[PDB]
Amino acid sequence: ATYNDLQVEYGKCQLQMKELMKKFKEIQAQNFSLINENQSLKKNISALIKTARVEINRKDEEISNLHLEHHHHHH
Amino acid sequence: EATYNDLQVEYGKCQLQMKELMKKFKEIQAQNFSLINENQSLKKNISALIKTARVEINRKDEEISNLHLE
């Protein structure tokens, strides 16, 4: 009777857990890619933050000391 | 096979595990939307920072050259 309906629902519920579990493993794998890429992108920035500051600082000094040359020369 | 009661019990368990699992899924999926956007933020920051550091290095280099020359 309605027993069979219940057995159908029960079996139906189980297969949706299986499917939700495939989907879960999928996203899970995606997240590991993103975590790995994000952490590397962040290291890239910091390395670029450093190097940019070093170069710009290196440019600022030579510009400054040139203004000291031109002044000293025409003074 | 098994009594009508046993099916009822197992269906009961099955719907509890399911609600539980459905909770872990939506949140890892939320975590998937956040990481993706963050990832896109990082790529845009690395884009702009290169752009900004690139434009400054040149202009400071045009300065120093222009000064050395004249």
Author numbering:
A (entry chain A): 71 to 145
B (entry chain B): 70 to 139
Give verbatim excerpts from the published study on this entry:
We determined a structure of the wild-type human FLASH NTD at 2.6 Å resolution using X-ray crystallography. The initial phases were obtained by the single anomalous dispersion (SAD) method using crystals of selenomethionyl FLASH NTD. The structure showed that FLASH NTD forms a coiled-coil dimer consisting of two parallel α-helices, one from each protomer. However, only residues 71 to 137 were observed in this structure, even though the expression construct contained residues 51–137. Residues 51–70, which include the LDLY motif previously shown to be essential for histone pre-mRNA processing and for binding the HCC, are disordered in this crystal. The length of the coiled-coil FLASH NTD dimer is approximately 100 Å, excluding the C-terminal hexahistidine tag observed for one of the protomers. The protomers do not superimpose perfectly onto each other (r.m.s.d. ~1.5 Å), and one of them appears to adopt a straighter conformation. Other hydrophobic interactions are formed by bulky residues such as Tyr73, Tyr80, and Phe94, as well as Met87 (selenomethionine in this structure). We also observed that Cys83 is situated in the dimer interface with the thiol side chains from the two protomers positioned near one another. While the electron density did not provide conclusive evidence for the existence of a disulfide bond, and the two sulfur atoms are separated by 3.4 Å distance in the current model, the structure raises the possibility that the observed FLASH NTD dimer might be mediated by a disulfide connection, which is unlikely to occur in the reducing environment in the nucleoplasm, the site of 3’-end processing.
FLASH, Flice-associated huge protein, was originally discovered as a protein involved in Fas-mediated apoptosis and later in regulation of expression of several genes, including oncogenes. Subsequent studies showed that FLASH localizes to Histone Locus Bodies in the nucleus, suggesting a role in expression of histone genes, and that it is essential for histone pre-mRNA processing. Biochemical studies revealed that the interacting N-terminal regions of Lsm11 and FLASH form a docking platform that recruits the HCC to the U7 snRNP. Our crystallographic studies of FLASH NTD demonstrate that residues 71–137 adopt a continuous and stable α-helical fold and mediate the formation of a coiled-coil dimer between two FLASH molecules.
